Structures are given as C-alpha cells and as structure tokens.
Amino acid sequence: SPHEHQQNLLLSRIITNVEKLNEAIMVMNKTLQEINIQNMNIELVAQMFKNYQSNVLFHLEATDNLKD
Amino acid sequence: LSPLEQEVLDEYERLSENMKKLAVLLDELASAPATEILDGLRELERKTSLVFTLLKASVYSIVLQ
C-alpha cells in the first residue's frame, strides 16, 4: 500500500515528463516538416549541377580533354 | 574631239581602276575571314554546347526523371 502510493506518485511525475517530452517531439517533427519544404529546391539545383558536371565531363572526354 | 576623248578616257580609266580594286578587295575581304569565321564557329558550337546545350540536357534529365 504505501509502496503503491510512492509508485503512483513517481508514475505521475513520469507521465508528466512523458507528455512534455512528446510535445517537444511534436514541435520537432513539425519544424522539420516545415524545413523539408525549403530543401527540395536546393536538392533539385544540386542534382542539376551534378548532372551538368557529369555530362560536361563525358563530352570533354569525348573532345580534346585538358585534364591530367 | 579631244575634250570628249579626255572625258571618256579618264572616266573609264577610273572605272577600270576601281573595278580592279573591287575584284581584289571583295575577294580578299570576303574570302580570308570566311574560313576563319566558320572554323572558329564550328569550334564555338563545340564550346557553347558545353554550357548551353548541356543546360538543356540537365534540365530535360531532371524534369523527366
């Protein structure tokens, strides 16, 4: 019985920490979701310069390349 | 008539001289750069494609993929 009271009280502070933790995590995921939208643009441009480098390399190798 | 002679002679002399200048100048002016122009321009195609045509390539590749 007294042990149970102690356990219930510790469980109460536990549950409060649980809810606070998860609320912060909700904010975390929400933040990342909003961020995500501001990343696809950059990703596209990254792949654009990537394939640019790839294709220009292939063509330079085709012509008189001037590498090492 | 000596005045008529002088007129037609001098005038046609100028015309013949100018036509010789025309032939030489026109031929060199329009022959010499022409080869240089097309050579540099075929090379220009080979170069400009590596900035613009590849831009179209990358754009098509990304938009399609």
UniProtKB/Swiss-Prot annotation, chain B:
UniProt key word Cell cycle: yes
Coiled coil segments of this chain: none
Residues of the full protein shown: 18 to 82 of 95
Molecular function, one GO term: microtubule plus-end binding
Keywords, alphabetical: Cell cycle, Cell division, Centromere, Chromosome, Chromosome partition, Cytoplasm, Cytoskeleton, Kinetochore, Microtubule, Mitosis, Nucleus
Domain of life of the native organism: Eukaryota
Protein function: Component of the DASH complex that connects microtubules with kinetochores and couples microtubule depolymerisation to chromosome movement; it is involved in retrieving kinetochores to the spindle poles before their re-orientation on the spindle in early mitosis and allows microtubule depolymerization to pull chromosomes apart and resist detachment during anaphase.
A single GO cellular-component term on record: DASH complex
Taxonomy of the source species: Eukaryota, Fungi, Dikarya, Ascomycota, Pezizomycotina
Family: Belongs to the DASH complex DAD3 family.
Subunit and interaction comment: Component of the DASH complex consisting of ASK1, DAD1, DAD2, DAD3, DAD4, DAM1, DUO1, HSK3, SPC19 and SPC34, with a stoichiometry of one copy of each subunit per complex. Multiple DASH complexes oligomerize to form a ring that encircles spindle microtubules and organizes the rod-like NDC80 complexes of the outer kinetochore. DASH complex oligomerization strengthens microtubule attachments. On cytoplasmic microtubules, DASH complexes appear to form patches instead of rings.
Protein name, as recorded: DASH complex subunit DAD3
Natural source organism: Chaetomium thermophilum (strain DSM 1495 / CBS 144.50 / IMI 039719)
GO BP terms: attachment of mitotic spindle microtubules to kinetochore; attachment of spindle microtubules to kinetochore; cell division; mitotic sister chromatid biorientation; protein transport along microtubule to mitotic spindle pole body
Keyword Cell membrane: no
Subcellular location field: Chromosome, Centromere, Kinetochore; Cytoplasm, Cytoskeleton, Spindle; Nucleus
